Write a protein that binds this ligand. Structure first.
Ligand SMILES: *C(=O)[C@@H](NC(=O)/C(=N\OC(C)(C)C(=O)O)c1csc(N)n1)[C@@H]1NC(C(=O)O)=C(C[n+]2ccccc2)CS1
Ligand SMILES: [Cl-]
Lengths: 230, 228
């Protein structure tokens, strides 16, 4: 069901990196990857977990809507985009750790773990997901099949909006797990075409911060190779 | 409250076109046009009516959701992108008039008018560029008399363009039957901490000029520090 495409490995080596790319054809329901064992290999979700978190914040009423403002606490941090007020949409955009940590605290770990367990997500982070596992969660979200309000899922799906043009829409989330060796960077989401939807999940070795861009770059070189995007 | 930046006219003349652009700064509650007269002049809404039409079709349940397929009837119409199955999102993107006609037949002229009159839309049905903004501002704010789900899903279906700088939600109109033949573009642009509603119409002497609807608008957004 998951075909392997060695020919994708050149994109990682051309950028002198290692990683995995997992595609899912929704109409056909075939998976495609450059490496299965790493595809099914589980890592920390670092910020790709702000997706299910936002669902729980919303569905439990920690977040009224995407317009509600979460003021700055006044503490200058070392990411300047973090030193401002935010709503769920901007907080997702700049991955504002301080904001989502104030969700995790108004919500409690007990509900978190049980709620994330209902999502069938994993198993401070707290859990471990593989790219393949990351795509099965994404498809549930796409189809409003998680057991929370459709309002929650539609709001999160709006906040995942990364890029849209006359040819496709991308809804995704970046991550970077950089507390445990290996440090590894995530990009999971999907690309919406006129008559099909391609899910993807990629992760790769990220010892620096300087290669984060390759997360999207290497993924987009695959989607061109497969003629998915022009 | 409504101001005239006449300097925008160079953008119409530069393509030897004539039209109006109407911008509404949301945070500042102040609006801008290149032509006070033509801004408030009423025109057929032609394809910009698909926004309220979609609202009504969703909120009465004729369309279950943005995924539901409306199969192509089989008539090879002139416009190629119509000749295929669509859903609410692709129907809106390609302005698929026959898909929406089946909506109408389903809903009835009666419920369609009543609702459209609960949206405070038109005045044979006409709407000015400034009037489009008032309606859009109520959709953006989820304040029209239809469910919230309805208004969200339509706002998803209007998505046109998005990057890390801005998001644009809009609908085009092309009207020819009576004169003049005019083009529409109405929508808003979602900034980090503001939103900018816009409604433009213009003279569409030829069909070729269709892309000048977005082009002339963006030159005004670009000229206004709204987009880069
Ligand atoms: C909405 O604007 C739709 N307009 C029409 O279908 C046409 N006229 O609408 C009239 C009758 C004027 C009205 O008052 O409603 C029409 C069909 S053919 C023609 N010369 N005028 C569709 N809107 C759009 C658009 O905004 O661009 C179209 C996209 N398009 C146009 C030409 C070629 C390919 C694609 C189709 S019409
Ligand atoms: Cl959206």
């Amino acid at each position: 069901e998951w075909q392997e495409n060695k020919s994708w490995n050149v994109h990682f080596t051309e950028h002198k990196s290692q990683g995995v790319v997992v595609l899912w054809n929704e109409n056909e329901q075939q998976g495609f990857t450059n490496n299965l064992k790493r595809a099914n290999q589980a890592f920390l979700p670092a910020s790709t977990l702000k997706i299910p978190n936002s669902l729980i914040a919303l569905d439990l009423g920690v977040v009224k809507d995407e317009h509600q403002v979460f003021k700055w606490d006044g503490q200058t941090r070392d990411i300047a985009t973090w030193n401002r007020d935010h709503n769920l949409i901007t907080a997702m955009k700049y991955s504002v750790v301080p904001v989502y940590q104030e969700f995790a605290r108004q919500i409690g770990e007990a509900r978190m773990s049980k709620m994330l367990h209902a999502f069938d997500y994993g198993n401070d982070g707290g859990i471990r997901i593989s790219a393949t596992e990351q795509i099965s969660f994404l498809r549930k979200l796409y189809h409003n099949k998680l057991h929370v309000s459709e309002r929650s899922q539609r709001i999160v799906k709006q906040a995942m909006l990364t890029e849209a043009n006359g040819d496709y829409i991308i809804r995704a989330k970046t991550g970077y797990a950089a507390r445990i060796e290996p440090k590894i960077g995530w990009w999971v989401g999907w690309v919406e075409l006129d008559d099909n939807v391609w899910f993807f999940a990629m992760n790769m070795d990220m010892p620096t911060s300087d290669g984060l861009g390759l997360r999207q770059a290497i993924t987009k070189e695959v989607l061109k190779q497969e003629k998915i995007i022009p």
